[PDB]
Amino acid sequence: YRQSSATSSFGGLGGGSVRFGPGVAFRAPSIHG
């Protein structure tokens, strides 16, 4: 599951995993797994 929240803060990356600042608001990982 690709993770995304901030815009134009990581550029165009194939993988969802992007660098995060002091505080990033993103969808928390699913309970599943």
Swiss-Prot record:
Expressed in a defined zone of basal keratinocytes in the deep outer root sheath of hair follicles. Also observed in sweat gland and mammary gland ductal and secretory cells, bile ducts, gastrointestinal tract, bladder urothelium, oral epithelia, esophagus, ectocervical epithelium (at protein level). Expressed in epidermal basal cells, in nipple epidermis and a defined region of the hair follicle. Also seen in a subset of vascular wall cells in both the veins and artery of human umbilical cord, and in umbilical cord vascular smooth muscle. The modification Omega-N-methylarginine is found at R2, R19, R27. It comes from the Eukaryota. The modification Phosphoserine is found at S9, S17, S30. Transmembrane segments: none annotated. The modification Asymmetric dimethylarginine is found at R19. Changing S30A: Abolishes phosphorylation; induces perinuclear collapse or short cytoplasmic filaments. Involved in the organization of myofibers. Together with KRT8, helps to link the contractile apparatus to dystrophin at the costameres of striated muscle. Belongs to the intermediate filament family. Heterotetramer of two type I and two type II keratins. Interacts with PNN and the actin-binding domain of DMD. Interacts with HCV core protein. This keratin differs from all other IF proteins in lacking the C-terminal tail domain. There are two types of cytoskeletal and microfibrillar keratin: I (acidic; 40-55 kDa) and II (neutral to basic; 56-70 kDa). This is Keratin, type I cytoskeletal 19. It comes from Homo sapiens (Human). The chain holds residues 6 to 38 of 400 of the full protein.
